[model samples]
Target: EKREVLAGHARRQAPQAVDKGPVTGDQRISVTVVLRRQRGDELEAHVERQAALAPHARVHLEREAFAASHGASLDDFAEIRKFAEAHGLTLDRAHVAAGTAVLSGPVDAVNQAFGVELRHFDHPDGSYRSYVGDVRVPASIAPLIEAVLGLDTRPVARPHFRLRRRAEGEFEARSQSAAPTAYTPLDVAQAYQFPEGLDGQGQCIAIIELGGGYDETSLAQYFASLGVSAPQVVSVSVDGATNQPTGDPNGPDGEVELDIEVAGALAPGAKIAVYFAPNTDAGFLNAITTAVHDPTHKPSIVSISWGGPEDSWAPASIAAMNRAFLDAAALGVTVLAAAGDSGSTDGEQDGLYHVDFPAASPYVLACGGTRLVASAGRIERETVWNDGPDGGSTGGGVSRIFPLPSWQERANVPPSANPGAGSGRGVPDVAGNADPATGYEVVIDGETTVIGGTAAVAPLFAALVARINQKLGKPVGYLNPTLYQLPPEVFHDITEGNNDIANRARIYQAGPGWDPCTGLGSPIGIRLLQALLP
Candidate 1:
């Protein structure tokens, strides 16, 4: 009776038919509360306007300045903490820089405080961790809270990794005959003419992962074979998830290794920090924020090779993740996310076209994929990465949630075939070769394997950004604005591919200028470096 009723709290909607029954009273859960920073909307708008400035003209904020000006107020957070403790909620961790806090307690108490009816449900992928329905906020903290996540346990994103089939004992490194068919990290770097001797020295590239583990033995072997010194690699645990190497042959290890091997190979001197977490929304969001606000690492760029269809995510989770990316941008850390590998519909059985989140978030540089062909040390031809029924295709489309930012509005890109195209943001902003048939060769679990998908594109781009940062002697924060300002020569436009799903029966094809399929096409290596550097 004493509590004031708050209006307009962020609501999380149930997905499909997951709600089956209420959670048991004894269940303990972790909840991530995303707080709205003071004048966050204004800060975002100011950032959007900064996109018009040249890369050199863009003034990056110091960590303290970003926290003071854009982060949530300590007073407000303390008030929320007081309220939470008063209601019997135990605070686990708090990050003022990202404006988030982690709460823990029994399901019943959580449900009572947040006005949620958390329930358990069975999923086809085989888990009872899934939950559904809306999560309401209390009046006292409603205005400060932007999202309340972790009440649900449904998986939100997939690892974008593809493997080439091989015989049992023949898993060792192949001969020169196989080298022509498979592209090594060095091959990609040389093809793009990435600056020699740069090696992203003195830079750290953070990779976000939802699942899987890495085998350092595999990493050492992979770089040894390439005649490159393996970069220092570290694993960071997030949301109670550890660097537990399950070595599951069919698990996400390939993706974990692929991201590491590629980024390490491209920028052999840069350190790679892999943030491992559960596939839940709260875990994913925490991984990103943890990396972004990590004082010791101070990563200049973070690459995300994981994402799900936009519709699969709750509104609160989406907003919260977007806010983290926005915070990263303001802190001068660039985020590179994979546009999905599931074509225009993002593998959804639903008949409508949708893009992948994090990628759909305007602050990230969405890395798309391409099928590349090379002959005698030179690229022969490249097309959008679409292998149809045999394999996956690149994911791109107009976002339903994000509006067209000021930077993209001037690019004059082609309209999306989807009826609601121009009303929102279009992905992706950049591309790389991700076709499994012409994929990157890496070592996973002591076996030489070929891996592809938009997963390869993200780290590849992240390494490039690292090299660019090293060469430019400064971080290139939030590249979309400066990217749009570059000329035609900075990218090799893909005009000969399409990402169409048979089920949805709609095709997004590549074209001359800023097509949805390939975005601005693959990077032109040193030319892009020249354009980005002053």
Candidate 2:
């Protein structure tokens, strides 16, 4: 039944029982449902029935605001809970999703209570529900999520990788070869043994490059040095193939190489997919969405190493696109974005404060940069990411275009402290390692380049999530909740560095807690993955 739920604006207590338990991987789920709309009073009727059906669901939330489309009010959390309670149901977390409601609870109970069935689920989407079995609810429910939320769950297309031909002579190879040793991150091998479980695997990791392309022959040779097979790198040309695909002076092809090499190196067996788009908003957005929804071959994890300024796109434009992304999230696909090379202020010489875009999108994980100075397995220092402009500025700050979701505010980002505060939304709920000097080593075009910055961290994270999806026997749908619940064993607390040059000496000194720079810190690799187990 088409449904929507809303309660009065009364704040209530979160069920302590639900709040206290470990966020079990099995207990939580990533849900995507297509919403059916009813004209007139039918909307109200659907809400009533939905509430009557599932009476004990916890943490119901909308991926985005309703106003995003119809300009409706988004303050439904508090009221939805009350509405559910009034209908004889236990509402732990109530949210308005798309045109319907998304709830998590005992699957059987949820199934019996709600009438929706998943339309379909695809493994290419990296989600567990392949819809090949009698997976009833997930089938009907998934479509409803898509309908209401605007997600892209089409099956993954083939040629999961995209490789660019660097102008004729930059680098060439007579034979296939592997990458160099330095191309791999030191922490990657030291932290987690490779070829351990990922050797001879046919996995593919997709990456989106806004500018420049990689040199395949040189890249293959680099992989040879690492003693790994040359990956089947594929490239997609979006926008006009302006000046052909080659490393340019701007945006830097090395950044793209570092992204592909590091992530591919970490998971040596996976093929690499790179989507090259223009720097403009249209080209970039189209490239990502096109890749995500491409039915020919779907890439489970999409790594975006480039982003625009917060003011770059209008809210409506962002909301609609993000809505589709949230749908993808529901379908088990994870999108990882670099928080930006600029620091929290976004490298503002004026010091007013600003953050970069795409990274600031709530639907995508904003991977931030960090200045890591560690020696012998110990962190000497860590701080907010600071790569410098030509080098790359760490992108972090409040988003001016989007509203902070309730989750970010709950993540402990105080309203007064958030730059987007007062404006009505939060930015950057998560982070990772992105420091140029402390970056990954890459052999691009037969020329060795030491690369760091959020660029390295973005793809590295994408590969990790891909591996996580492979292990769980299911995709981590909307991973934020579970990730936030995970502790240090799941991540490396890089607590000794600074990215904000001026704030260098303040308490900004990274040391043993969540600083603006590293967030919960870097991943401890396989150990972190193990900790994600139920």
lDDT of each: 0.81, 0.49
Candidate 1 residue spans exceeding 4 A from truth: 2-20, 128-132, 166-180, 412-416, 419-422, 503-506
lDDT of 1 by residue, 239-325 (tens): 888776677644788889999999999898888889999888899999999998888888999999999987777777888898888
- What is candidate 2's lDDT per residue for 1-534, written digit by digit as tens? 434321111112211212222222333332322233223143323332332221122122232422243221234433433433433334432223333343344333333333322222323223322111122222323233222111112211111111222213225653212111112464644543222464314455668776667777667877787777665677877544322336442334666677778777766666677777655434455566556654445566777776655543333335445654654554345777776565555544554455566666666776766555554544445456544434454555555566656445444333323333454333444455455445555776557655656767777777776666666555453555455556656666655555454444331234564444555566666665565555
Cα error, residue 287 of model 2, in Å, equals 0.9
Clashes of 2: 81
Query: What are the RMSDs of all candidates, in order?
Result: 3.4, 17.4
